[PDB]
Design an enzyme around this catalytic site. Structure first.
Site, PDB file in Angstrom:
ATOM      1  N   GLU A 104       0.822  -0.982  -0.044  1.00 16.70           N
ATOM      2  CA  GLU A 104      -0.074   0.033  -0.096  1.00 16.70           C
ATOM      3  C   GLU A 104       0.635   1.200  -0.262  1.00 16.70           C
ATOM      4  O   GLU A 104       0.351   2.185  -0.583  1.00 16.70           O
ATOM      5  CB  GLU A 104      -0.777  -0.027   1.370  1.00 16.70           C
ATOM      6  CG  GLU A 104      -2.146  -0.920   1.066  1.00 16.70           C
ATOM      7  CD  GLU A 104      -3.026  -0.670   0.088  1.00 16.70           C
ATOM      8  OE1 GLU A 104      -2.960   0.256  -0.367  1.00 16.70           O
ATOM      9  OE2 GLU A 104      -4.108  -1.667   0.025  1.00 16.70           O
TER      10      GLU A 104
ATOM     11  N   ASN B  88      -7.975   9.291  -5.496  1.00 17.32           N
ATOM     12  CA  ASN B  88      -8.780   8.712  -6.401  1.00 17.32           C
ATOM     13  C   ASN B  88      -9.692   9.272  -7.252  1.00 17.32           C
ATOM     14  O   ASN B  88      -9.776  10.498  -6.992  1.00 17.32           O
ATOM     15  CB  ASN B  88      -9.736   7.713  -5.191  1.00 17.32           C
ATOM     16  CG  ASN B  88      -8.887   6.779  -4.322  1.00 17.32           C
ATOM     17  OD1 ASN B  88      -9.070   7.013  -2.977  1.00 17.32           O
ATOM     18  ND2 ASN B  88      -7.768   6.179  -4.651  1.00 17.32           N
TER      19      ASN B  88
ATOM     20  N   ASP C 178     -12.676   9.444  -7.595  1.00 13.73           N
ATOM     21  CA  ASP C 178     -13.978   9.990  -7.088  1.00 13.73           C
ATOM     22  C   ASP C 178     -13.830  11.160  -6.175  1.00 13.73           C
ATOM     23  O   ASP C 178     -14.503  12.143  -5.601  1.00 13.73           O
ATOM     24  CB  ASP C 178     -14.642   9.043  -6.028  1.00 13.73           C
ATOM     25  CG  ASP C 178     -14.040   8.402  -4.968  1.00 13.73           C
ATOM     26  OD1 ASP C 178     -12.971   9.137  -4.464  1.00 13.73           O
ATOM     27  OD2 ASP C 178     -14.554   7.412  -4.376  1.00 13.73           O
TER      28      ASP C 178
ATOM     29  N   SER D 127     -11.904  11.319  -3.588  1.00 19.69           N
ATOM     30  CA  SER D 127     -11.163  11.010  -2.265  1.00 19.69           C
ATOM     31  C   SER D 127      -9.632  10.980  -2.274  1.00 19.69           C
ATOM     32  O   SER D 127      -9.201  10.743  -3.246  1.00 19.69           O
ATOM     33  CB  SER D 127     -11.997   9.697  -1.510  1.00 19.69           C
ATOM     34  OG  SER D 127     -11.592   8.666  -2.363  1.00 19.69           O
TER      35      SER D 127
ATOM     36  N   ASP E 168      -6.358   8.675  -0.387  1.00 18.59           N
ATOM     37  CA  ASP E 168      -5.898   7.672   0.704  1.00 18.59           C
ATOM     38  C   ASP E 168      -4.654   8.041   1.470  1.00 18.59           C
ATOM     39  O   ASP E 168      -3.803   8.720   0.866  1.00 18.59           O
ATOM     40  CB  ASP E 168      -5.497   6.303   0.002  1.00 18.59           C
ATOM     41  CG  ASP E 168      -6.642   5.801  -0.854  1.00 18.59           C
ATOM     42  OD1 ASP E 168      -7.867   5.914  -0.413  1.00 18.59           O
ATOM     43  OD2 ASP E 168      -6.378   4.909  -1.723  1.00 18.59           O
TER      44      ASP E 168
ATOM     45  N   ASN F 101      -9.000   5.470   3.605  1.00 18.13           N
ATOM     46  CA  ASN F 101      -9.657   6.403   2.444  1.00 18.13           C
ATOM     47  C   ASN F 101     -10.530   7.455   2.970  1.00 18.13           C
ATOM     48  O   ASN F 101     -11.216   7.005   4.103  1.00 18.13           O
ATOM     49  CB  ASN F 101     -10.573   5.443   1.463  1.00 18.13           C
ATOM     50  CG  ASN F 101     -11.220   6.283   0.459  1.00 18.13           C
ATOM     51  OD1 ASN F 101     -12.118   6.566   0.371  1.00 18.13           O
ATOM     52  ND2 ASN F 101     -10.401   6.823  -0.494  1.00 18.13           N
TER      53      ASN F 101
END
Ligand code: CL
Ligand code: CL
Ligand code: NA
Ligand code: NA
Length: 129
Positions: A35, A46, A48, A50, A52, A59
């Protein structure tokens, strides 16, 4: 902070992640490796809108507040910046809520695709724990 492999294993064990909800320590170290490459300061946006955050790439649409993900929730009740600290406590405590929500570690796409069904104990081999 960029953790060493065994350094992070010992930190996660001390915070109660070994066999938490049935997931052995090697699963958590494998997930952190793919990750974030063990970097507490990793961020990724991301599609959309958002973002991380941190060593486990938690998220902002669901789990933390970053002030720029409209309509999102803050289920861990923390600003997302707290997830970037060199102290992993906040990341670990939030991850315990995520993994308990019904879907296990499948919440982490890299764990699903790169750790699940592999020899995860290899990630803690040689470490003094
Ligand atoms: Cl393991
Ligand atoms: Cl599970
Ligand atoms: Na399990
Ligand atoms: Na949020």
């Amino acid at each position: 902070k960029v953790f060493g492999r065994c350094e992070l294993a010992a930190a996660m064990k001390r915070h109660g992640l070994d066999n938490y909800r049935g997931y052995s320590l090697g699963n958590w170290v494998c997930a952190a490796k793919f990750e974030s490459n063990f970097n507490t300061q990793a961020t990724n946006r991301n599609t959309d809108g958002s973002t991380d955050y941190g060593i486990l790439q938690i998220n902002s649409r669901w789990w933390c507040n970053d002030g720029r993900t409209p309509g999102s929730r803050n289920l861990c009740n923390i600003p997302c910046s707290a997830l970037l600290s060199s102290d992993i406590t906040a990341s670990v405590n939030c991850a315990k809520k995520i993994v308990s929500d019904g879907n296990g570690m499948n919440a982490w796409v890299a764990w699903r695709n790169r750790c699940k069904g592999t020899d995860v104990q290899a990630w803690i081999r040689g470490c003094r724990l």
